Coordinates of all heavy atoms in Angstrom, one line a residue:
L1 N -23.8 -23.5 -58.5 CA -23.1 -22.5 -57.6 C -23.9 -22.1 -56.4 O -23.4 -22.1 -55.3 CB -22.7 -21.2 -58.4 CG -21.5 -21.3 -59.4 CD1 -21.8 -22.2 -60.6 CD2 -21.1 -19.9 -59.8
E2 N -25.2 -21.8 -56.6 CA -26.1 -21.5 -55.4 C -26.3 -22.7 -54.6 O -26.3 -22.6 -53.3 CB -27.4 -20.9 -55.8 CG -27.3 -19.5 -56.5 CD -27.0 -19.6 -58.0 OE1 -26.9 -20.7 -58.5 OE2 -26.8 -18.6 -58.6
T3 N -26.4 -23.9 -55.2 CA -26.5 -25.1 -54.3 C -25.3 -25.3 -53.5 O -25.4 -25.6 -52.3 CB -26.8 -26.4 -55.2 OG1 -25.8 -26.4 -56.3 CG2 -28.2 -26.3 -55.8
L4 N -24.1 -25.1 -54.1 CA -22.9 -25.2 -53.4 C -22.8 -24.2 -52.2 O -22.5 -24.6 -51.1 CB -21.7 -25.0 -54.3 CG -20.3 -25.2 -53.8 CD1 -20.0 -26.5 -53.3 CD2 -19.2 -24.8 -54.8
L5 N -23.1 -23.0 -52.5 CA -23.1 -21.9 -51.5 C -24.0 -22.2 -50.3 O -23.7 -22.0 -49.2 CB -23.4 -20.5 -52.1 CG -22.4 -20.0 -53.1 CD1 -23.1 -19.1 -54.1 CD2 -21.3 -19.1 -52.4
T6 N -25.2 -22.6 -50.6 CA -26.2 -22.9 -49.6 C -26.0 -24.1 -48.8 O -26.3 -24.2 -47.6 CB -27.6 -22.9 -50.2 OG1 -27.7 -23.9 -51.3 CG2 -28.0 -21.6 -50.8
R7 N -25.4 -25.2 -49.4 CA -25.3 -26.5 -48.7 C -23.8 -26.7 -48.2 O -23.6 -26.9 -47.1 CB -25.8 -27.6 -49.6 CG -27.2 -28.0 -49.4 CD -28.1 -26.9 -49.8 NE -29.6 -27.2 -49.6 CZ -30.6 -26.4 -49.7 NH1 -30.3 -25.1 -49.9 NH2 -31.8 -26.8 -49.4
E8 N -22.9 -26.7 -49.2 CA -21.5 -27.2 -48.8 C -20.7 -26.0 -48.2 O -20.0 -26.2 -47.2 CB -20.8 -27.7 -50.0 CG -21.1 -29.2 -50.3 CD -22.2 -29.3 -51.3 OE1 -22.6 -28.3 -51.9 OE2 -22.7 -30.4 -51.5
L9 N -20.9 -24.8 -48.7 CA -20.2 -23.6 -48.2 C -20.8 -22.9 -47.0 O -20.2 -22.1 -46.4 CB -20.0 -22.7 -49.4 CG -19.2 -21.4 -49.4 CD1 -18.7 -21.1 -50.8 CD2 -19.9 -20.2 -48.8
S10 N -22.0 -23.3 -46.7 CA -22.7 -22.7 -45.6 C -22.0 -22.8 -44.3 O -21.9 -21.8 -43.5 CB -24.1 -23.2 -45.4 OG -24.1 -24.6 -45.2
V11 N -21.4 -24.0 -44.0 CA -20.6 -24.2 -42.8 C -19.3 -23.3 -42.7 O -18.7 -23.1 -41.7 CB -20.2 -25.6 -42.6 CG1 -21.5 -26.5 -42.7 CG2 -19.2 -26.1 -43.6
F12 N -18.9 -22.8 -43.9 CA -17.6 -22.0 -44.0 C -17.9 -20.5 -43.9 O -17.6 -19.7 -44.8 CB -16.9 -22.3 -45.2 CG -16.5 -23.8 -45.4 CD1 -17.1 -24.6 -46.3 CD2 -15.5 -24.3 -44.5 CE1 -16.7 -26.0 -46.4 CE2 -15.1 -25.6 -44.6 CZ -15.7 -26.5 -45.5
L13 N -18.5 -20.1 -42.7 CA -18.8 -18.7 -42.5 C -17.6 -18.0 -42.0 O -16.7 -18.5 -41.3 CB -19.9 -18.6 -41.5 CG -21.3 -19.1 -41.9 CD1 -22.3 -19.0 -40.7 CD2 -21.8 -18.3 -43.1
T14 N -17.4 -16.7 -42.4 CA -16.3 -15.9 -42.0 C -16.8 -14.5 -41.7 O -17.8 -14.0 -42.3 CB -15.3 -15.8 -43.1 OG1 -15.0 -17.1 -43.7 CG2 -14.0 -15.2 -42.6
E15 N -16.2 -13.8 -40.7 CA -16.6 -12.5 -40.3 C -16.3 -11.5 -41.5 O -15.3 -11.6 -42.1 CB -15.8 -12.1 -39.0 CG -16.4 -10.9 -38.4 CD -16.1 -10.8 -36.9 OE1 -14.9 -10.4 -36.5 OE2 -16.9 -11.1 -36.1
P16 N -17.3 -10.6 -41.7 CA -17.1 -9.6 -42.8 C -15.9 -8.7 -42.7 O -15.2 -8.4 -43.6 CB -18.4 -8.9 -42.9 CG -19.0 -9.1 -41.5 CD -18.6 -10.5 -41.1
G17 N -15.5 -8.4 -41.4 CA -14.4 -7.5 -41.2 C -13.1 -8.2 -40.9 O -12.1 -7.6 -40.8
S18 N -13.2 -9.5 -40.7 CA -12.0 -10.3 -40.4 C -11.0 -10.3 -41.6 O -11.5 -10.3 -42.7 CB -12.4 -11.7 -40.0 OG -13.1 -12.4 -41.0
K19 N -9.7 -10.4 -41.3 CA -8.7 -10.4 -42.3 C -8.4 -11.9 -42.8 O -7.7 -12.0 -43.7 CB -7.4 -9.8 -41.8 CG -7.5 -8.4 -41.4 CD -7.8 -7.5 -42.6 CE -7.8 -6.0 -42.3 NZ -8.9 -5.7 -41.4
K20 N -9.0 -12.9 -42.1 CA -8.8 -14.2 -42.5 C -9.5 -14.6 -43.8 O -9.1 -15.6 -44.4 CB -9.3 -15.2 -41.4 CG -10.6 -14.9 -40.8 CD -10.9 -15.7 -39.5 CE -12.2 -15.2 -38.8 NZ -11.9 -14.2 -37.8
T21 N -10.5 -13.8 -44.2 CA -11.2 -14.1 -45.4 C -10.3 -14.0 -46.7 O -9.4 -13.1 -46.7 CB -12.4 -13.2 -45.6 OG1 -13.1 -13.5 -46.8 CG2 -12.0 -11.8 -45.6
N22 N -10.6 -14.7 -47.7 CA -9.8 -14.7 -48.9 C -10.6 -14.4 -50.2 O -10.2 -13.7 -51.0 CB -9.1 -16.1 -49.1 CG -10.0 -17.3 -48.9 OD1 -11.1 -17.3 -49.3 ND2 -9.5 -18.3 -48.2
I23 N -11.9 -14.9 -50.2 CA -12.8 -14.7 -51.4 C -14.0 -13.9 -50.9 O -14.7 -14.4 -50.0 CB -13.1 -16.0 -52.1 CG1 -11.9 -16.7 -52.6 CG2 -14.1 -15.7 -53.2 CD1 -11.2 -15.9 -53.7
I24 N -14.3 -12.8 -51.5 CA -15.4 -11.9 -51.0 C -16.2 -11.5 -52.2 O -15.7 -11.2 -53.3 CB -14.8 -10.6 -50.4 CG1 -14.0 -10.9 -49.1 CG2 -15.9 -9.6 -50.0 CD1 -13.3 -9.8 -48.5
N25 N -17.5 -11.6 -52.0 CA -18.5 -11.1 -53.1 C -19.2 -9.9 -52.6 O -19.7 -9.8 -51.5 CB -19.5 -12.2 -53.4 CG -20.4 -11.8 -54.5 OD1 -20.1 -10.9 -55.3 ND2 -21.5 -12.6 -54.7
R26 N -19.1 -8.8 -53.4 CA -19.8 -7.5 -53.1 C -21.2 -7.5 -53.5 O -21.8 -6.4 -53.3 CB -19.0 -6.4 -53.8 CG -19.0 -6.4 -55.3 CD -18.3 -5.2 -55.9 NE -18.2 -5.2 -57.3 CZ -17.8 -4.3 -58.1 NH1 -17.3 -3.2 -57.6 NH2 -17.8 -4.4 -59.4
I27 N -21.8 -8.5 -54.0 CA -23.2 -8.5 -54.3 C -24.0 -8.4 -53.0 O -25.0 -7.6 -53.0 CB -23.6 -9.8 -55.1 CG1 -22.9 -9.7 -56.5 CG2 -25.1 -9.9 -55.2 CD1 -23.1 -11.0 -57.3
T28 N -23.7 -9.2 -52.0 CA -24.4 -9.2 -50.7 C -23.3 -9.0 -49.6 O -23.8 -9.1 -48.4 CB -25.2 -10.4 -50.5 OG1 -24.3 -11.5 -50.3 CG2 -26.1 -10.7 -51.6
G29 N -22.1 -8.6 -49.9 CA -21.1 -8.4 -48.8 C -20.7 -9.7 -48.1 O -20.6 -9.7 -46.8
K30 N -20.6 -10.8 -48.8 CA -20.2 -12.1 -48.2 C -18.7 -12.3 -48.2 O -18.1 -12.1 -49.3 CB -20.9 -13.2 -48.8 CG -20.8 -13.3 -50.3 CD -21.5 -14.5 -51.0 CE -23.0 -14.4 -51.0 NZ -23.4 -13.2 -51.8
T31 N -18.1 -12.6 -47.1 CA -16.6 -12.9 -47.0 C -16.4 -14.3 -46.6 O -17.0 -14.8 -45.7 CB -16.0 -11.9 -46.0 OG1 -16.5 -12.2 -44.7 CG2 -16.3 -10.5 -46.3
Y32 N -15.5 -15.0 -47.3 CA -15.2 -16.4 -47.1 C -13.7 -16.6 -46.9 O -12.9 -15.9 -47.5 CB -15.7 -17.2 -48.2 CG -17.2 -17.1 -48.4 CD1 -17.8 -16.9 -49.6 CD2 -18.1 -17.2 -47.3 CE1 -19.2 -16.8 -49.8 CE2 -19.4 -17.1 -47.4 CZ -20.0 -16.9 -48.7 OH -21.4 -16.8 -48.8
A33 N -13.4 -17.6 -46.1 CA -12.0 -18.0 -45.9 C -11.8 -19.5 -46.2 O -11.2 -20.3 -45.4 CB -11.6 -17.8 -44.4
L34 N -12.2 -19.9 -47.4 CA -12.3 -21.3 -47.7 C -10.9 -22.0 -47.9 O -10.0 -21.3 -48.4 CB -13.2 -21.5 -49.0 CG -14.4 -20.6 -49.2 CD1 -15.1 -20.9 -50.5 CD2 -15.3 -20.8 -48.0
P35 N -10.8 -23.2 -47.6 CA -9.5 -23.9 -48.0 C -9.5 -24.2 -49.5 O -10.4 -23.9 -50.2 CB -9.6 -25.2 -47.1 CG -10.5 -24.9 -46.0 CD -11.5 -24.0 -46.5
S36 N -8.4 -25.0 -49.9 CA -8.2 -25.0 -51.3 C -9.2 -25.9 -52.1 O -9.4 -25.6 -53.3 CB -6.8 -25.7 -51.5 OG -5.8 -24.9 -50.9

């Protein structure tokens, strides 16, 4: 999971306040808008 987040998911950055995000983690306030 951390390898995926750091390497493959790193390019999929999303603004924390943007509504385009779909999956959000409240551990560090990360917001993501990943495709399927």
Side-chain angles (χ1 to χ4, degrees):
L1 284 70
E2 293 83 4
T3 50
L4 182 64
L5 293 148
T6 54
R7 266 66 181 169
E8 277 93 12
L9 188 153
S10 57
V11 307
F12 299 109
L13 293 176
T14 314
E15 194 154 79
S18 61
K19 300 294 186 292
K20 46 189 173 271
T21 180
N22 47 41
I23 299 296
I24 298 175
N25 186 12
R26 64 175 175 177
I27 293 174
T28 67
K30 53 177 75 62
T31 63
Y32 299 134
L34 321 181
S36 298

